[PDB]
Design a protein around this nucleic acid. Structure first.
Ligand SMILES: [Mg+2]
Ligand SMILES: [Zn+2]
Ligand SMILES: [Zn+2]
Ligand SMILES: [Zn+2]
Lengths: 81, 553, 280, 120, 97, 175, 171
RNA sequence: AUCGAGAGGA
DNA sequence: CTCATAGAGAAGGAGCAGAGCG
DNA sequence: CGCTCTGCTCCTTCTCCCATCCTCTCGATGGCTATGAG
């Protein structure tokens, strides 16, 4: 589904958590970032920076009642839910 | 190299003796066990015929693997005689309410729309319940059966052309009572005799797939002959524990023992039939085997016929070993012991924050956490190494990238380490670590919380006094339930899960989970009285006191 | 037992509630999709209210002096007065409000005005008064259309759902009907002008804040309602001690209650040892 | 009518002298019991006696008693049970497991800017 | 420290299957098995450094899967073997939906 | 590796397929009418000897071109070795052998000629398999074709077999 | 004989993956697994079709760790012979046991019992040929072999066929 | 190790 | 010949009271 | 007009589960019967 993605355009705290944890993990795994390590050593704060900026290498698969799914990118989603 | 996968569809049913033999690791035929009777070994056809490993015996179907990531292997004892499985005896018994002998089908058919409506039941579990309800009236295997349309035309199908027998409870088996009992002086009262397993198998032999499936079941995964036990599994020692009490003693799975007894009993039967014996001698030995097996499998057999193991111990059957309540289902399946946990007595402390716990340094001394090496923390990590497992702000282990959990207690590396990115520095627990705390029992989220660490001298948990509200607690020796997260991701989640702000108000009634301390409240009431005024010097100290003070009097 | 009984209950992305069979238990979260965390019990000003009082509080007339508002209170009040079509503009919503009252007397025939609601205007207007430091001696810059047509738009803007089914839209419309009643009542034009003296800047500001919260009050999906509900009932259920007596009562006879009643209910035990009826 | 009336009494009598606790949710639970157009009894002959995942039903009350039928009818585990997956050491489709994070090829192209390092 | 069902219930209310699982297996269980997919049973001859893990009766050295399962779950399977009740643990969801 | 697409119906071992006979007894994997991983009915592409070379030649050039983004039979064999140096490093020797092999047995070395070959065979409604057998099979007479291919023996007239065959013979002279 | 099909390969992303050369690498990896692979299900992987335009789908996150899943689609052509299938092959080798024959990417067994009974090994006739009848067959010669079956090995496949027939024989 | 009974704690 | 040694429920069941064809 | 087949309704009978987590010591098995050496 392209413009057929009927779920909300907002990202939930659950999704947020998965994202944050994911990026924090990636930080601890020496992953590249969208926002540079500006002094701060804490991955959660580091992630928080690019998280706030929605600069996240990520898409979430939501699901339909028939088992299908929707493509919601981080940039697509509104970080307020 | 097997691909990493996840189970999506588990097909259930009963195992096929045929396939069982085909996949059998060993035939298993020895009525005895370990050391072949004092020879420092195991048994030719039991215990070691390519079966699972034991302590220091690599075996494991001669695939070694020690006994770490090493599953064992099952042998399979073919049975000379067929044994009725109890859980299916009851089912078969009910099935027999509609069974028609020699026709591969039942007493009822399509020649009656009402029967067709019973047949029209989608759920076969209900379908045959209705069939049982109906077929029990006039259970007669008529050879030719009148068609619904013009009954003068009869449809042949009653392969045994006679009345059908009824069933009565009789110990290990059931008694066949062949209907009869006809008008001519109660002619041939229901021919009484214990039902033959072979007779039942003859039924199974003639059962068609069409009708078998009209009764549900599963012609592939649940076939009627698999209700009869004709070959039994022989678990590897890990599954049917060998055991060793005190010092290198025995005490093994008594089912191995009882099974050997069953086999020995079978052997005496083998003799009774092979060399010859009274049919009653043969009868009883077999009756006993049905008995031994029934109780072997599940010792919950009709109360009275429930023998106690040779040391006066209610034979612990397969089911007994596998029961619930506690047993297995709750014993481990609904609750396992946690390696990163604690049970430590709590206490109050008015100086601490809601999520700042005064954590006993004695605990900090005993607990650690697997951090990883990054270029922006290496120096601090080498300080942990220099601190060793001695300092409370030190470390105990480091997993070297190769998978080596380095023990700093004995290592001289306190002054020497080549930390590369990602080594798991198992440091001591430090302040602010989001550790779980809880008070059981409870029927609400409030009670499980994640909080920041504040290490303390003296020990006991120094807690914000208001914590007792959401926990409905007190400080009466309550050994707080702790669980320490090992995942960084989880640590982040915990700030997003059990933070006080995220818990304090419950949508249940949408209420805050605590209020002002009763001493404080009354004091405040006094504080809010019209005559309440305060001295500057008192105020000054208060102004310092209050952390929110902006510097303005 | 109850934990297990209520275990399999959850919210899908489409916000329906269903079991593991997919059977839709409930086609909509708590019949509103709104988060209880953000719901509060408050009084609605049109459950009671005499016929006259209703009209006096809400009716506005450009020709009938009885409900004519102060022409200086509103910057353009003296201009608007006399223009019948704008009296009609107002009447559209007024007649709907009195119709709403006609409905409400049936909706909550028990006369209860105080109900758990997602929206609290009284708090909002407190915020607005403080936000702009409103000078209540000066004329307001709102127009009659800003108020009437603006609220019609506001009503239309309460987009809790994400779809295109006329039917679910209707469900949405019903869900906020109480709120549009409220807007027509608590915030009737003369209330806006006489009671609140709302400026346009404040008005506009408020509108943006209404939606902000409206959004924030929406329920998340993927929820295991079963345990959430089980805790919400079970925890207090244990606190609810005592059964058939020793907590006062009306009937002199003891009444099957507490867990005796619970149990026979839980296990469908139709054996009423205290089989009463109340016939009106 | 009886469903609603039951709830009516539930609230009036079962809740009764307590506190407000989401009457609609209370009502829902009543609806749950009767979604089939009948009424579930909280027992082995009611709640257990369903058409649902046997493993879940086993964790509720009975054991092999249930399994015997599963073997007889040759049931199959479709791996969609919430708690059942948990029992299997798997993650259930609830909360953190209710959605599947991904990085689509499409977005990976989006993640090929001057910060080419966002490509993976 | 024994895990309780209420602790589970909390994880359920939280949706914290993550933490649940790291305690469930990462800190208290898990076992690496080779299950022979073709029949859904662990009919696997353990040909470790050969990669020839023949499935007896299937003659299958290929359709075998690596699965990280609870040791207790391993036992459950084995119990079912002892119990004579089939559980063909297949990894393929043929049920479209 | 996959090569599945077709969903299963019986995961449990049953009969293990039918015998893989040349008499169009192709398996599900070699189903003449099936759907590929694009959701497109990709009928069994029973590739012929000479046209395989066209495909391979193109592929050798393809790989080389993709990399760039980042005549006698003997002359052709020389060119193949050059392409092998350009496209591999001793890997997929299966291909190395195949293309040298196909070159050695080429009968329709050029695409234009092959197009005509394809046209003749598919115009008669031959199964993809049967087309492949004839497109690759050199043949002096229909009796050879029928003996070597029984499915022609029991289905196709000799008039048509010979008509096409001698036209193919001419196309062989037209490599 | 050779069969083209749009196939797929499940490649899993792991934490080692962080840089800017996605499909570039994946194409290499794909070929490393796929090219030359040999299993009876399809025979021999002759060649992957369409090096570019690779459908890697996505990097679906696998939350158990820092891995992610890319099911990669591509076309490929394979070699597969059938019972009684007539093949213009060529000889690889020869001993007194018989011949080893090359067809495309596969080796084929053409033994002395699959060849005409009037033809026996003659070491005096080099390359170590069979030479006791008009069917003189040398290593350097070619051969029309009718594959009677496929003796699949684990790592490779050795088909088996014969030439003892009027329209079969050395080429 | 292992189960059984008893005492106690909240 | 002599010692030594190994309460409440569901479920089932039996009886008691009718319609219809030979 | 009377008797079979059938219908439901009554008592009789069997059988079931009974809170959550946690902490200790005292106890482990018992009286009876057949084969071979100096
Ligand atoms: Mg206490
Ligand atoms: Zn092993
Ligand atoms: Zn019959
Ligand atoms: Zn298998």
């Amino acid at each position: 589904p392209k413009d057929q993605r009927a779920t909300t355009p907002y990202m939930t705290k659950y999704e947020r958590a998965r994202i944050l944890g994911t990026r924090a993990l990636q930080i601890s795994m020496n992953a590249p970032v969208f926002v540079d390590l500006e002094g701060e050593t804490d991955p959660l704060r580091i992630a928080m920076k690019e998280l706030a900026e929605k600069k996240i290498p990520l898409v979430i698969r939501r699901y339909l009642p028939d088992g299908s799914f929707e493509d919601w990118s981080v940039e697509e989603l509104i970080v307020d839910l | 190299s097997a691909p990493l996968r996840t189970v999506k569809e588990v097909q259930f049913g009963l195992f096929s003796p045929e396939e069982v033999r085909a996949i059998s690791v060993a035939k298993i035929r020895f009525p005895e066990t370990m050391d072949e009777t004092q020879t420092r070994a195991k048994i030719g056809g039991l215990n070691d015929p390519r079966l699972g490993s034991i302590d220091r015996n690599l075996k494991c179907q001669t695939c070694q693997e020690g006994m770490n990531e090493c599953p064992g292997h099952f042998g399979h004892i073919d049975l000379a005689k067929p044994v009725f499985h109890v859980g299916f005896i009851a089912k078969i018994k009910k099935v027999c309410e509609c069974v028609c002998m020699h026709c591969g089908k039942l007493l009822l058919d399509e020649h009656n729309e009402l029967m067709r409506q019973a047949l029209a039941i989608k759920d076969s579990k209900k379908r045959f319940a209705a069939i049982w309800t109906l077929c029990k009236t006039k259970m007669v295997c008529e050879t030719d059966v009148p068609s619904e349309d013009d009954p003068t035309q009869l449809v042949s199908r009653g392969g045994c052309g006679n009345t059908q027998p009824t069933i009565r409870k009789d110990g290990l088996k059931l008694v066949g009572s062949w209907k009869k009992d006809r008008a001519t002086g109660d002619a041939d009262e229901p021919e009484l005799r214990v039902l033959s397993t072979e007779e039942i198998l003859n039924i199974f032999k003639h059962i068609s797939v069409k009708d078998f499936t009209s009764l549900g079941f599963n012609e592939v995964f649940s076939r009627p002959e698999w209700m009869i036990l004709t070959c039994l599994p022989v678990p590897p020692p890990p599954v049917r524990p060998s055991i060793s009490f005190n010092e290198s003693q025995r005490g093994e799975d008594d089912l191995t023992f009882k099974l050997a007894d069953i086999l020995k009993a079978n052997i005496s039967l083998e003799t009774l039939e092979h060399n010859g014996a009274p049919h009653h001698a043969i009868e009883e030995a077999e009756s006993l085997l049905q008995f031994h097996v029934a109780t072997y499998m599940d010792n919950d057999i009709a109360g009275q016929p429930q023998a106690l193991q040779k040391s006066g111990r209610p034979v612990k059957s397969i089911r007994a070993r596998l029961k619930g309540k506690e047993g297995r289902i709750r014993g481990n399946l609904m609750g396992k012991r946690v390696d990163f946990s604690a049970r430590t007595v709590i206490s109050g402390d008015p100086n601490l924050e809601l999520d700042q716990v005064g954590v006993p340094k004695s605990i900090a001394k005993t607990l650690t956490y697997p951090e990883v090496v990054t270029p922006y923390n290496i120096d601090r990590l080498t300080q942990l190494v220099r601190n060793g497992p001695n300092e409370h702000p030190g470390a105990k282990y480091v997993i070297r990238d190769s998978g080596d959990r380095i023990d700093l207690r004995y290592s001289k590396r306190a002054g020497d380490i080549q930390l590369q990115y990602g080594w798991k520095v198992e440091r001591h627990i430090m302040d602010n670590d989001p550790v779980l705390f809880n008070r059981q029992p409870s029927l609400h989220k409030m009670s499980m919380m994640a909080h920041r660490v504040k290490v303390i001298p003296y020990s006991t948990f120094r807690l914000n006094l208001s914590v007792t509200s959401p926990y409905n607690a007190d400080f009466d020796g309550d050994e707080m339930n702790l669980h320490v997260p090992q995942s960084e991701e989880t640590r982040a989640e915990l700030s997003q899960l059990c933070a006080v702000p995220l818990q304090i108000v419950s949508p249940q009634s949408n209420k805050p989970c605590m209020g002002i301390v009763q001493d404080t409240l009354c004091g405040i009431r006094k504080l809010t009285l019209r005559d309440t005024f305060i001295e500057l010097d008192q105020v000054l100290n208060m102004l310092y006191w209050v952390p929110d003070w902006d510097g303005v009097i | 037992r109850l934990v297990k009984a209520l275990e399999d209950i959850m919210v899908h992305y489409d916000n329906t509630t269903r079991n593991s069979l997919g059977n839709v238990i409930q086609f909509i979260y708590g019949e509103d999709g709104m988060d209880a965390a953000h719901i509060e019990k408050q009084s609605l000003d049109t459950i009671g209210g005499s016929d006259a009082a209703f009209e006096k509080r809400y009716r506005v007339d450009l020709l009938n002096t009885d409900h004519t508002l102060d022409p200086s209170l509103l910057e353009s009040g003296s201009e608007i007065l006399g223009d019948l079509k704008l009296q009609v503009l107002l009447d559209e919503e007024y007649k709907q409000l009195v119709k709403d009252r006609k409905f409400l007397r049936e909706v909550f025939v028990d006369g209860e005005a105080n109900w758990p609601l997602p929206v609290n205007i009284r708090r909002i207007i407190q915020n607005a008064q403080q936000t702009f430091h409103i000078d209540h001696t000066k004329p307001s810059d709102l127009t009659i259309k800003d108020i009437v047509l603006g609220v019609k738009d506001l009503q239309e803007n309460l987009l809790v759902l994400r779809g295109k089914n006329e039917i679910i839209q209707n469900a949405q419309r019903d869900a906020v009907t109480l709120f549009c009643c409220l807007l027509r009542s608590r915030l009737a034009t003369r209330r806006v002008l006489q009671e609140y003296r709302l400026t346009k800047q404040a008005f506009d500001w408020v509108l943006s804040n209404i939606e902000a919260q409206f959004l924030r009050s929406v329920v998340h999906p993927g929820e295991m309602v079963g345990v959430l509900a089980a805790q919400s009932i079970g925890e207090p259920a244990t606190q609810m001690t005592l059964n058939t007596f020793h907590f006062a009562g009306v009937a002199s006879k003891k009444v099957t209650s507490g867990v005796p009643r619970l149990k026979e209910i839980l296990n469908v035990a139709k054996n009423m040892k205290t089989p009463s009826l109340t016939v009106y | 009518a009886g469903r609603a009336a039951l709830y009516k009494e539930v609230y009036n009598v079962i809740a009764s002298d307590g506190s407000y606790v989401n009457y609609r949710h209370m009502a829902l639970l009543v609806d749950v019991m009767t979604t089939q157009g009948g009424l579930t009894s909280v027992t082995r002959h009611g709640f257990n006696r369903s058409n649902t995942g046997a493993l879940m039903r086993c964790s509720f009350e009975e054991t092999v008693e249930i399994l015997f039928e599963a073997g007889a009818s040759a049931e199959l585990d479709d791996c969609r049970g919430v708690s059942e997956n948990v029992i299997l050491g798997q993650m259930a489709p609830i909360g953190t497991g209710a959605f599947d994070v991904m990085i689509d090829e499409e977005s990976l192209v989006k993640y090929m800017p001057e910060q080419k390092i966002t490509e993976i | 420290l024994r895990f309780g069902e209420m602790e589970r219930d909390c994880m359920i209310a939280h949706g914290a299957a993550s933490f649940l699982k790291e305690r469930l297996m990462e800190a208290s269980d898990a076992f690496r098995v080779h299950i022979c997919g073709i029949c859904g049973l662990m009919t696997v001859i353990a040909k470790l450094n050969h990669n020839q893990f023949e499935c007896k009766g299937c003659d299958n050295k290929i359709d075998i899967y690596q699965i990280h399962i609870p040791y207790a779950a391993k036992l459950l399977f084995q119990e079912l073997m002892a119990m004579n009740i089939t559980p063909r643990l297949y990894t393929d969801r043929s049920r479209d939906f | 590796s996959t090569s599945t697409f077709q969903t299963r119906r019986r995961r449990l071992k049953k009969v293990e397929e039918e015998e893989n006979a040349a008499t169009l007894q192709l398996g599900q994997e070699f189903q003449l009418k099936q759907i590929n991983h694009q959701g497109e009915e990709e009928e069994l592409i029973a590739l012929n000897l000479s046209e395989a070379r066209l495909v391979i030649k193109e592929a050798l050039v393809e790989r080389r071109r993709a990399f760039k983004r980042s005549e006698t039979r003997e002359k052709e064999l020389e060119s193949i070795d050059v392409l092998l140096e350009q496209t591999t490093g001793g890997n997929n020797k299966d291909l190395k052998n195949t293309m040298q092999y196909l070159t050695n047995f080429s009968r329709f070395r050029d695409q234009e000629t092959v197009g005509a070959v394809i046209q003749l065979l598919k115009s008669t409604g031959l199964h993809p398999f049967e087309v492949a057998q004839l497109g690759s099979l050199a043949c002096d007479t229909a009796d050879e074709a029928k003996t070597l291919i029984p499915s022609l023996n029991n289905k196709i007239s000799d008039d048509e077999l010979e008509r096409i065959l001698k036209e193919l013979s001419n196309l062989e002279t037209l490599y | 004989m050779f069969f083209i099909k749009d196939l797929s390969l499940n490649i899993t992303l792991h934490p080692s993956f962080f840089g800017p050369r996605m499909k570039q690498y994946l194409k290499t990896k794909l070929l490393e697994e796929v090219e030359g692979s040999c299993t009876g299900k399809f025979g021999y992987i002759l060649c992957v079709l369409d090096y570019d335009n690779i459908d890697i789908q996505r990097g679906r996150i696998l939350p158990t760790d820092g891995s992610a899943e890319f099911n990669v689609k591509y076309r490929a052509v394979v070699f597969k012979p059938f019972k009684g299938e007539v093949v213009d092959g060529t000889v690889v080798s020869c001993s007194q046991h018989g011949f080893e024959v090359q067809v495309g990417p596969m080796k084929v067994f053409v033994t002395k019992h699959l060849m005409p009974q009037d033809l026996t090994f003659n070491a005096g006739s080099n390359p170590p040929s069979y030479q006791s009848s008009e069917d003189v067959i040398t290593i350097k010669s070619r051969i029309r072999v009718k594959i009677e079956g496929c003796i699949s090995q684990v790592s490779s496949i050795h088909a088996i066929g014969s030439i003892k027939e009027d329209y079969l024989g050395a080429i």
